[PDB]
């Protein structure tokens, strides 16, 4: 059984919790329910490999979190989430990426860019704008909807695949 420690980062309100809960529980949390920062473990088969995913869904970024500091230090791959109807959250992506590189003191960290809420007609971030940002970082870009269950597994499984390739190349 292969472990992958994943960290979901990005601005408040973009759907990090909704994406993680959809993946873990196949449920969509009610729109107005309290979010909480928490970690989740789930055994899953990914490309025929039996995997243990250890996922931290981050929150409360303006106060100390011992768990978040541990997962940022030790996390193996990062899902950088913005919402496609929220330009500020997309324009925040470079700060989240910079935080990750600083903690890892590395320019080469497994990451996937995720544009969530692709079920909303009020899009303000064009798919091609985000694809270009991801291309400039050298990482995959995936558009998701936690609500209509579009590409949720693809987003997380793609990050696992990025970690697997990182490991294979370094050896
Ligand atoms: N329409 C839609 N709303 C979403 C989606 N994902 C999250 N939300 C809503 O967006 C708000 C923020 O979601 P949340 O998971 O709490 O975001 P976090 O703060 O990034 O964890 C909540 O009201 C969610 O119900 C999605 O894919 N589509
Ligand atoms: Mg949350």
Author numbering: 1 to 171
Article, verbatim:
KRAS, the most frequently mutated oncogene in human cancer, produces two isoforms, KRAS4a and KRAS4b, through alternative splicing. These isoforms differ in exon 4, which encodes the final 15 residues of the G-domain and hypervariable regions (HVRs), vital for trafficking and membrane localization. RAS proteins act as binary switches, transitioning between the active [guanosine triphosphate (GTP)–bound] and inactive [guanosine diphosphate (GDP)–bound] forms. We present the structures of both the active and inactive forms of KRAS4a, as well as of the complex between KRAS4a and the primary effector protein RAF1 and compare them to previously reported KRAS4b structures.
